[PDB]
Enzyme design. Structure first.
Site, PDB file in Angstrom:
ATOM      1  N   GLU A 128       0.818  -1.224   0.000  1.00 28.95           N
ATOM      2  CA  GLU A 128       0.000   0.000   0.000  1.00 28.95           C
ATOM      3  C   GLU A 128       0.854   1.277   0.000  1.00 28.95           C
ATOM      4  O   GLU A 128       0.679   2.177   0.835  1.00 28.95           O
ATOM      5  CB  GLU A 128      -0.978  -0.007   1.191  1.00 28.95           C
ATOM      6  CG  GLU A 128      -1.862  -1.265   1.271  1.00 28.95           C
ATOM      7  CD  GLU A 128      -2.838  -1.264   2.466  1.00 28.95           C
ATOM      8  OE1 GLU A 128      -2.742  -0.362   3.321  1.00 28.95           O
ATOM      9  OE2 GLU A 128      -3.690  -2.184   2.553  1.00 28.95           O
ATOM     10  N   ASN A 169       2.239  -4.997  -3.268  1.00 31.00           N
ATOM     11  CA  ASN A 169       0.851  -5.320  -2.991  1.00 31.00           C
ATOM     12  C   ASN A 169       0.049  -4.048  -2.780  1.00 31.00           C
ATOM     13  O   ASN A 169       0.503  -3.128  -2.099  1.00 31.00           O
ATOM     14  CB  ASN A 169       0.754  -6.209  -1.756  1.00 31.00           C
ATOM     15  CG  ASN A 169      -0.629  -6.796  -1.566  1.00 31.00           C
ATOM     16  OD1 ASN A 169      -1.204  -7.399  -2.483  1.00 31.00           O
ATOM     17  ND2 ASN A 169      -1.171  -6.630  -0.363  1.00 31.00           N
ATOM     18  N   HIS A 206     -10.293  -6.283  -2.535  1.00 31.50           N
ATOM     19  CA  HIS A 206     -11.366  -6.114  -1.559  1.00 31.50           C
ATOM     20  C   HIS A 206     -12.515  -5.378  -2.245  1.00 31.50           C
ATOM     21  O   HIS A 206     -12.457  -4.155  -2.412  1.00 31.50           O
ATOM     22  CB  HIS A 206     -10.870  -5.335  -0.337  1.00 31.50           C
ATOM     23  CG  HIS A 206      -9.803  -6.035   0.463  1.00 31.50           C
ATOM     24  ND1 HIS A 206     -10.045  -7.169   1.210  1.00 31.50           N
ATOM     25  CD2 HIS A 206      -8.492  -5.739   0.652  1.00 31.50           C
ATOM     26  CE1 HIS A 206      -8.934  -7.541   1.818  1.00 31.50           C
ATOM     27  NE2 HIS A 206      -7.975  -6.696   1.490  1.00 31.50           N
ATOM     28  N   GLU A 234      -6.000 -10.820  -1.567  1.00 31.33           N
ATOM     29  CA  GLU A 234      -6.813 -10.604  -0.362  1.00 31.33           C
ATOM     30  C   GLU A 234      -8.297 -10.512  -0.728  1.00 31.33           C
ATOM     31  O   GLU A 234      -9.013  -9.602  -0.299  1.00 31.33           O
ATOM     32  CB  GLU A 234      -6.365  -9.347   0.392  1.00 31.33           C
ATOM     33  CG  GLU A 234      -4.884  -9.287   0.799  1.00 31.33           C
ATOM     34  CD  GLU A 234      -4.505  -8.045   1.643  1.00 31.33           C
ATOM     35  OE1 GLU A 234      -5.408  -7.372   2.218  1.00 31.33           O
ATOM     36  OE2 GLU A 234      -3.286  -7.755   1.751  1.00 31.33           O
ATOM     37  N   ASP A 236     -12.127 -10.482  -0.998  1.00 34.14           N
ATOM     38  CA  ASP A 236     -13.418 -10.665  -0.341  1.00 34.14           C
ATOM     39  C   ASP A 236     -14.413  -9.727  -1.011  1.00 34.14           C
ATOM     40  O   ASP A 236     -14.033  -8.769  -1.681  1.00 34.14           O
ATOM     41  CB  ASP A 236     -13.369 -10.461   1.192  1.00 34.14           C
ATOM     42  CG  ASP A 236     -12.605  -9.193   1.629  1.00 34.14           C
ATOM     43  OD1 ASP A 236     -12.654  -8.157   0.922  1.00 34.14           O
ATOM     44  OD2 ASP A 236     -11.944  -9.243   2.696  1.00 34.14           O
TER      45      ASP A 236
END
Length: 299
Positions: A128, A169, A206, A234, A236
């Site tokens: 990030e 990432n 996400h 990651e 979801d």
């Protein structure tokens, strides 16, 4: 049916999940993970506030449990994460001396990657590092070391464990036209052309409901940066609807360099966004329609 086994028949490397000791030692997470997934990410136990709460004072008990468990069960491990502005203890963010900050950063990377040398398939070397506008986040590493901190981190990681794939990432890389996605492709292509050893781009993914539809185009755009591989790291999905999950699965299947997918948790209650029931297993630790929707998509 195992979605990990199924996706590997498509030549991908894994379909994995975030976890740690608190999950593995409770309910049926361990059983679901042996059966249905082929890779694990430490949800929290390898972060900086977990591993080096005080300068030079390393805690590896939880991380060791995950690494041992993963190895005993033949699961791949993604290391997560080394250089990150979040969940950073104050003793790191307070340092104002440049030389001291290089020592602190390089020690943290080298120590963690050496402890698990040869055991880690990919490390999220920096996490990030971008603002939403595509500019570099002016974190403490940026402000005290300088913009070169990215290059230093990746070179130090390569030297610490030449086996591991070195990833960058980030999140909100889910639409190709978004400023952050443009900046991620531009910068990584540039940094690789300067010789900086960036092996993979990780896309957290996400998603909001309906967010799946743009991910194929975005993932294919991230692949034009030219890294050996990219990955969904990651995943979801708010509401946990099958449409968005199958969209991401097809996104992956459509990018030859996309090695696989990690879902950020086994079961809804344990999700960091549990209130949106965003995962593939429910409060009963039973597979949801999205999971069966992924099974049908992989046959």
């Amino acid at each position: 049916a195992s979605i990990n086994d199924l996706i590997k028949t498509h030549g991908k490397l894994y379909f994995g999940v975030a976890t740690d000791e608190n999950r593995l030692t409770a309910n049926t997470n361990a059983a679901i993970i042996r059966a249905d997934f082929g890779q694990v990410t430490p949800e929290n136990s390898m972060k900086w506030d977990a591993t080096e709460p005080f300068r030079g004072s390393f805690n590896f008990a939880n991380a060791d449990y995950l690494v041992n468990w993963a190895q005993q069960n033949g699961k791949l491990i993604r290391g997560h994460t080394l250089v990150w502005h979040s969940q950073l203890p104050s003793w790191v963010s307070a340092i104002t001396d440049r030389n001291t900050m290089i020592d602190v950063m390089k020690n943290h990377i080298t120590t963690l990657m050496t402890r698990y040398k040869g055991k880690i398939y990919a490390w999220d070397v920096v996490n990030e590092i971008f603002n939403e506008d595509g500019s570099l986040r002016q974190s403490v590493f940026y402000n005290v070391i300088g913009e070169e901190y990215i290059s230093i981190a990746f070179q130090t990681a390569r030297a610490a464990d030449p086996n591991a794939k070195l990833y960058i990432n980030d999140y909100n890389l889910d639409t190709a036209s978004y400023a952050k996605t443009q900046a991620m492709v531009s910068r990584v292509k540039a940094w690789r052309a300067a010789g900086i050893p960036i092996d993979g781009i990780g896309s957290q993914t996400h998603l909001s409901a309906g967010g799946g539809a743009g991910v194929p185009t975005a993932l294919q755009y991230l692949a034009t940066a030219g890294t050996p591989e990219v990955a969904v790291t990651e995943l979801d999905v708010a509401t946990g609807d099958p449409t968005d999950y199958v969209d991401v699965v097809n996104a992956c299947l459509s990018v030859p360099s996309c090695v696989g997918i990690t879902v950020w948790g086994v079961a809804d209650p344990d999700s960091w966004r549990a209130s949106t029931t965003p995962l593939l297993f429910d409060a009963s630790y039973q597979p949801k329609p999205a999971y069966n929707a992924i099974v049908d998509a992989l046959r």
